[PDB]
Amino acid sequence: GAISSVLNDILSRLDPPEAEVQIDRLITGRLQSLQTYVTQQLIRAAEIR
Amino acid sequence: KNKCVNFNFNGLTGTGVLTESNKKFLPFQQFGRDIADTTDAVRDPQTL
C-alpha cells in the first residue's frame, strides 16, 4: 500500500513529515514476513526432533 | 573501484563496490537485475 518498495526512493522524493507514513506501511508488512518464517521453522524443528 | 563507495547513478542511490563487468548486455539495455530484483549493474551517463 505504499508508493514504492525501495526505501531509498521514498526517502529522496518526500519530506520526513511526509515519508513517515510510507515507511510505516513497509515496516508492518515486512515484520509479518519474519514472524511467519520463524513460526513455520519452529514447527519443522519439532518434527525433526 | 574496489571500495565501498556511495552511489548516485542519476537517481540510483545505493552503497557497494565497483568492479569491471565481464558479461554482455544489450546495446539498448541500461542496467540489469538479479533473481532478488535489485540493482546488480549500471551504465554510466557519461561514458559507455
UniProtKB/Swiss-Prot annotation, chain A:
Protein name: Spike protein S2'
Role: Subunit of the fusion protein that is processed upon entry into the host cell. Mediates fusion of the virion and cellular membranes by functioning as a class I viral fusion protein. Contains a viral fusion peptide that is unmasked after S2 cleavage. This cleavage can occur at the cell membrane by host TMPRSS2 or during endocytosis by host CSTL. In either case, this triggers an extensive and irreversible conformational change that leads to fusion of the viral envelope with the cellular cytoplasmic membrane, releasing viral genomic RNA into the host cell cytoplasm.
Result after altering L11F: In strain: Omicron/BA.1
Parent-protein residues present: 971 to 1019 of 1273
Annotated phenotype, changing S12A: In strain: Alpha/B.1.1.7
UniProtKB/Swiss-Prot annotation, chain B:
Domain of life: Viruses
Quaternary assembly: Binds to host ACE2. RBD also interacts with the N-linked glycan on 'Asn-90' of ACE2. Cleavage of S generates a polybasic C-terminal sequence on S1 that binds to host Neuropilin-1 (NRP1) and Neuropilin-2 (NRP2) receptors. Interacts with host integrin alpha-5/beta-1 (ITGA5:ITGB1) and with ACE2 in complex with integrin alpha-5/beta-1 (ITGA5:ITGB1). May interact via cytoplasmic c-terminus with M protein. May interact (via N-terminus) with host bilirubin and biliverdin, thereby preventing antibody binding to the SARS-CoV-2 spike NTD via an allosteric mechanism.
Protein purpose: Attaches the virion to the cell membrane by interacting with host receptor, initiating the infection. The major receptor is host ACE2. When S2/S2' has been cleaved, binding to the receptor triggers direct fusion at the cell membrane. When S2/S2' has not been cleaved, binding to the receptor results in internalization of the virus by endocytosis using host TFRC and GRM2 and leading to fusion of the virion membrane with the host endosomal membrane. Alternatively, may use NRP1/NRP2 and integrin as entry receptors.
Protein name, per record: Spike protein S1
Organism listed in the record: Severe acute respiratory syndrome coronavirus 2
